[PDB]
């Protein structure tokens, strides 16, 4: 049968995406972004996952040495049965997925899934090979070695008004039968209007490098063509009857 999950409270996630938002522009290598990673890992902590900081100095396209720092949160260490949930929190010279991903912990914190949880946050995104940084560097080696999941879902640009997501092309030929999932679920729930059952474009994204430097298919959740309460409900309750239903 099929679990009902607990409600996502997208007021808690708007409020999680306003306090990012002022610490002004999260550019790598500014008191905005190192105030703003502390606070992510602090409520990693606060919310009950196992926090895991990666520090890494990640060369950019230009020669900057970016201060690199990855923040993972994880549920249920000990299932080797898990889901991988991810979106960046850098801002380009964010917020949407992370705030998203926020609410979705602290509910992990209310009542666990049966699978493990890992919320993972990259960082030096957006600053082909030269954009996403920190997931390739994540992707090549993750935070836990032989680290899996049996599939990901990123959150990219997920709380526009009346936001509609497309099958991403890359999702869409290395991770359909998830993609699909999701999708089908978030009818079920009556957010169809904004996840579109059609291919829409191909993005370069994080998901690209998880699936690839850490194999995982991995699908991206993006708005394909402003904070708004009513799309962040749509994106975290389906996320979350997604995951609860995970067995």
Same mark, same amino acid.
């Given at each position: 049968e099929v679990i009902k999950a607990p409600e996502f409270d997208a007021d808690s996630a708007y409020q999680y995406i306003q306090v990012q938002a002022d610490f002004g522009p999260r550019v790598p290598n500014t008191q905005a972004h190192k105030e703003c990673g502390e606070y992510l890992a602090g409520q990693l902590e606060k919310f009950g996952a196992k926090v895991y900081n990666q520090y890494a100095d990640l060369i950019a396209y230009d020669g900057t040495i970016l201060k690199s720092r990855n923040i993972i949160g994880a549920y249920k #260490?000990?299932?080797k049965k898990r889901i991988l949930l991810c979106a960046h929190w850098d801002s380009r010279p964010g917020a949407s997925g992370v705030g998203v991903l926020l609410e979705i912990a602290r509910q992990i914190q209310k009542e666990q899934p049966a699978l493990g949880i890992d919320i993972v946050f990259f960082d030096?995104? $957006?600053?082909? $090979?030269?954009?996403c940084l920190g997931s390739q560097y994540w992707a090549r080696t #993750?935070? !836990?070695?032989n680290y899996n999941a049996r599939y990901g879902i990123l959150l990219d640009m !997920? *709380? *526009?008004?009346d936001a509609t997501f497309y099958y991403e092309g890359y999702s869409a030929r290395t991770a359909r039968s998830e993609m699909k999932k999701i999708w089908k679920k978030a009818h079920e729930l009556g957010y169809g209007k904004y996840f579109v059952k059609e291919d829409g474009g191909e993005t370069v994204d994080d998901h690209i490098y998880v699936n690839k430097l850490a194999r995982i298919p991995c699908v991206d959740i993006i708005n394909y063509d402003n904070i708004d309460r009513n799309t962040l409900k749509a994106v975290g309750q389906t996320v979350m009857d997604v995951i609860y239903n995970e067995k």
């Open positions: #260490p000990e299932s030096s995104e $957006d600053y082909q $090979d030269t954009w #993750p935070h !836990v070695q !997920v *709380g *526009g008004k």
